[PDB]
Amino acid sequence: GKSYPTVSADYQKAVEKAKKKLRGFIAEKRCAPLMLRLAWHSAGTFDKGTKTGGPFGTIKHPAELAHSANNGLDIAVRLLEPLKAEFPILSYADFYQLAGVVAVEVTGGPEVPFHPGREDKPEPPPEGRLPDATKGSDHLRDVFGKAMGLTDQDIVALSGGHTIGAAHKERSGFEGPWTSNPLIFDNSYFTELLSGEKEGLLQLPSDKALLSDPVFRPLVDKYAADEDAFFADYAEAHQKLSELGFADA
Numbered sequence: 001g002k003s004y005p006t007v008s009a010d011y012q013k014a015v016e017k018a019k020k021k022l023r024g025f026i027a028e029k030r031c032a033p034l035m036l037r038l039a040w041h042s043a044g045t046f047d048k049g050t051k052t053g054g055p056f057g058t059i060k061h062p063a064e065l066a067h068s069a070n071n072g073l074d075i076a077v078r079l080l081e082p083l084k085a086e087f088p089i090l091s092y093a094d095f096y097q098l099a100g101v102v103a104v105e106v107t108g109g110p111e112v113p114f115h116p117g118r119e120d121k122p123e124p125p126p127e128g129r130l131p132d133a134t135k136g137s138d139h140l141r142d143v144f145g146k147a148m149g150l151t152d153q154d155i156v157a158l159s160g161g162h163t164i165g166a167a168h169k170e171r172s173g174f175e176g177p178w179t180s181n182p183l184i185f186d187n188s189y190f191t192e193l194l195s196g197e198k199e200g201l202l203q204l205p206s207d208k209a210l211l212s213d214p215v216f217r218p219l220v221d222k223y224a225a226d227e228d229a230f231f232a233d234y235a236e237a238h239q240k241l242s243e244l245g246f247a248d249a
């Protein structure tokens with residue numbers, strides 16, 4: 001259902017050059033998980049019924065950074081500011097989604113297609129649209145489905161983003177990585193979810209909700225057994241996420 005806007009040749013040149021600069025920067029700084037979180041929290045505020053929120057540059061606004069769900073993302077915004085300044089033609093909206101795409105790639109994940117043209121919008125969405133880690137499947141559907149308009153498949157695949165990074169007790173309150181290899185994008189999130197709780201690794205209640213839901217559980221099993229299928233479905237879902245409200249939406 002997408003009709004992507006035309007952008008100028010100079011805009012597309014900058015996308016390509018920014019993509020390369022983002023790879024080097026993100027790899028050097030070891031901040032891929034944080035940049036994935038920044039892109040996801042940028043996009044995940046989209047409400048389909050009102051066409052508000054979504055990936056339109058607003059996460060850099062102090063008002064949106066102050067949302068509790070976004071604790072720590074001010075670090076991400078600050079980290080990208082010097083690089084962004086080298087690409088004045090790009091929207092913040094695009095830059096942050098591109099950083100998200102690059103974060104998945106440089107940690108060994110799928111190549112998520114990227115289309116430019118998101119405009120930076122003036123008003124951040126209201127607080128409280130991002131998911132609550134202590135809730136379960138009904139909540140996940142309200143947030144990903146009723147609000148964002150993503151599918152049950154997308155929910156499970158996107159939960160797989162936890163294959164990189166960690167929680168921090170000073171940000172969410174939760175603490176530690178989901179996997180033994182938190183800078184490697186692979187299907188290990190699902191493998192760990194199936195094996196039970198191993199000391200040192202994190203499982204949120206929202207992760208565990210995938211195991212007991214009749215639609216989510218077969219997807220967890222599929223992804224744990226078939227990393228290729230995970231990568232395919234992940235790439236589809238991340239593209240959709242990154243394009244909520246954009247290019248028809």
Ligand code: HEM
Nearest residue numbers: 033034036040131132133158161165166167168171172206
């Ligand atoms: C399904 C509902 C979700 C819940 C409840 C949730 C919740 C959380 C929480 C509580 C944290 C820890 C923040 C911190 O303390 O530093 C976190 C981190 C993270 N989340 Fe999720 N998340 C969800 C979905 C997603 C999605 C869809 C993605 C991207 C596809 C994602 C990517 C990440 C990443 C990469 C981190 C690690 C950040 C870092 O290492 O600094 N999450 N999430």
